Each structure stands twice: as C-alpha cells, then as structure tokens.
C-alpha cells in the first residue's frame, strides 16, 4: 500500500508532531464532576503548571462514562485553540482516559519489532501497568522511542516513511502511518485519539514498526 511521505508535511506540522510525541500529559488518580459542551471533561488546575485541563471526547457517552470517576490520563497535550473554561490558561488533550483502579502488580512488557528499509534492527520494549490501556498511550510510547533513536520527526533525518502496526490477539488490528498527520496544528494532529480507544493490555501480541529512508 502507499504510505505518506515526510516531504508532504510543512515544517510546522513536523515540529508539532515532534512536540506532541515528546511531551505528553501523564497523571494518575484525578476526577472531574464537570462537563463542558456535552463532550469534554474539565479538571481545574490539574494540568501542567496548574493550568486547567480540558479532556475532549468524541461523544457525550464517553464524557458521561468518566464523569465522577478516579481516572488516569496519558495523552498528547496542546495549547493553541484550546478553548478556555475560566481565566486561567487552558491545556487540552483528546481521550487518553482510563479507570485508576484497574491495575496490574508488575508492568506488562510489549515487544516492538523494528525494521529499517526491510532490515531487522533491535527489538524495542514498551511497558504498562494498566489492565486496560489507551491505544494513544501505547502509540506515544512507540513514537517517543522512534523519535529518540531514529529521528522520525526531524526534517533532515533520513527517515521518510513509517508504519506502526499493533498485531492483536483479537481479530481487529490497529496501525498508524507516522507521516499521515490530519493537519498541521496540534488540535488537528491529536484528534485521531478522540474515540478514547482502549485495549486490554494482554490482548496485544506485539508491535511491528517499519521505517523507510528516502533514500
């Protein structure tokens, strides 16, 4: 199939992708009893530096499902076009939300096989102690590794194409084309995560990463 090319992206989209996958918002054991505009949950002064945190969902159902629960958050956070709730600075993310109580004693380890130009490289590892984990969290963790080691979001690196595939034990698999950004700004890039897609962490067989140089 045809994957998207890094060369299609503007310098901004690229810096934005770098920024998103390197600086996620991570926080455990917080709660919101406030809904904004049907879809969003508001956690006042819970964001970075005491900012207000707005968690956006695809539907009312999702927002309602997590209203008044002890949740854990792991998501790509952004600032531009993040609608304010108070006078305080507002910080946004889509999805990234699981129940705080659903935990494992030790971290589950998930292997990520890597190939570059069809040549097998070192297997990478990602970890989670959540029984149920967002696809977003695992995707950020993979992309952080690929950013660090292969410089996927640096303009002048030799990586031009890449595909991350989640080989599931269940029948539906998942994948991400790392250069198929939905727009150039954060609020567009991160919107792919608004469904709050969540997996049983033991349902993943492994992750396959294929990167390609041009050339």
């Amino acid at each position, epitope marked *: 199939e045809d994957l998207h090319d890094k060369s299609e992206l503007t310098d901004l989209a690229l810096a934005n992708a*770098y920024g998103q996958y390197n600086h996620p918002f991570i926080k455990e054991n917080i709660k919101s009893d406030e809904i904004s505009g049907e879809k969003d949950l508001i956690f006042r002064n819970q964001g970075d530096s005491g900012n207000d945190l707005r968690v956006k969902f695809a539907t009312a159902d999702l927002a309602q499902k997590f209203k008044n629960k002890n949740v854990d958050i792991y998501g790509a956070s952004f600032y531009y076009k993040c609608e304010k709730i108070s006078e305080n600075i507002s910080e946004c993310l889509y999805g990234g939300t699981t129940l705080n109580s659903e935990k494992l004693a030790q971290e589950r380890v998930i292997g990520a096989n890597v190939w570059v130009d069809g040549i097998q490289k070192e297997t990478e590892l990602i970890r989670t102690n959540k029984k149920n984990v967002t696809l977003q969290e695992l995707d950020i963790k993979i992309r952080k590794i690929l950013s660090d080691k292969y410089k996927i979001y640096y303009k002048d690196s030799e990586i031009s194409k890449g595909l991350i595939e989640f080989d599931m034990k269940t029948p539906r698999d998942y994948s991400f084309d790392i250069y198929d950004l939905k727009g150039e700004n954060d609020y567009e890039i991160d919107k792919i995560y608004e469904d709050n897609k969540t997996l049983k962490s033991d349902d993943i067989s492994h992750i396959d990463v294929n990167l390609y140089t041009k050339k």
Partner: T-cell receptor
Amino acid sequence: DGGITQSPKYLFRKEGQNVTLSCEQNLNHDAMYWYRQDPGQGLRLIYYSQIVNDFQKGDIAEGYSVSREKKESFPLTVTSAQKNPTAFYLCASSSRSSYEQYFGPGTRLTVTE
Amino acid sequence: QLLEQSPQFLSIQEGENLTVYCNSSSVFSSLQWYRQEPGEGPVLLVTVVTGGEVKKLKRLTFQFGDARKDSSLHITAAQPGDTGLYLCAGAGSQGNLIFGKGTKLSVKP
C-alpha cells in the same frame, strides 16, 4: 545533583603561544559546545560535539581545535593561527544535541603581540 | 537560520512592566531564554516546547507563539536586580542552538 565548570577564570598569553581551555561536566550530558562572545556579535559557536569521540566545526572554527575522548570533558585549544584570540570563552552542555544548554562560568583570554 | 530580538537595549524605571520579543521565519521545536551578567555564564530561565505555551515563573511570563516562530518574555514590576542581557535561543537543525543577539536590560532604582 551536578554542574559544568571551566578553568581558569583569566588567561594571558603572548601572541603565537597555543593554549588549551578546560570544560568539565558531570551532568551526564552527551553534547558539549564552545562559544566566543565579542561585544558586537554576541555568542558565536566555535566547535561542538554531539556525543563522545564525535565533534564538528561551528561557524568560526578557524584557528581552533578540539577533542572528545571522554563524555565529561571538551577541551578547546586556541592556536597561533587564530588571529583575534582575545575573547570571553563559554562552554555549554546539553542532554542531547539541540536541547536546552547549561553554561559554564566562562574564561577570559587576552593575547597581546 | 536566524533569531531576531527586540528591543536591543531597554532602560526602564523600577516598577514598570516591559516585554521583550524574539522572532524568526524558521519553526522551532523548543525555545530557551537566558539571563547573563557581564563576564559570567548565561543562566537558563525557561524552555518552552509547545506552540502557544505560556509559562509563569514569579514576575516573568514566557510565551511560545502559536506557529512556533516567536516567543516573548514579559516582566512585571521590574526590579534593579533584573538588569542583565536577556538571550533567546532556539533548537537548531544541526544538533545546535540558534541564539538571538539579546535585549540588554537596565532597570533604574
């Protein structure tokens, strides 16, 4: 926790005599940098090193040389070939290349004919 | 690759507010501000890493532009101890930082 240092504070040399400036860092940083600062031009990058045993030329590398045997240090040698060696010399390190830099206290070098 | 700072020189009275500005035509994944005293090492004040980020450290407020092309530093209630060279620096493309020429601030008691 740790830091980055330079020595000595002041250096005086006769024109034509090579000197080497020391910069040492226990911050566990991979990347190290040498700058000079002249009143008209602010900070200008002389040489830098993204990782142990790898270095490359800055914008004003002529007359200077470096080496990077060790992670923790990055010595700058000023050679006779430099021409305007008199300057304030600043070394810096970062976790990885292009990240936020932490600077040493600097060294004044004056050279006269 | 270029980073422009304005104003180049600023003298102001204790108690006033001021804004210094750093801009480029280039995009940056991060931007740093430093404060340097003459004959000393620049001191890191902040790093901003997300377009539209605002960070507040006491009297100093830093902002990263929405398009990642600029930043500003805003000082409120200026104090004589704020006097110094304020340098902005951006993540460069070749494992380096790109430095502005600075705003030289003098705050009069």
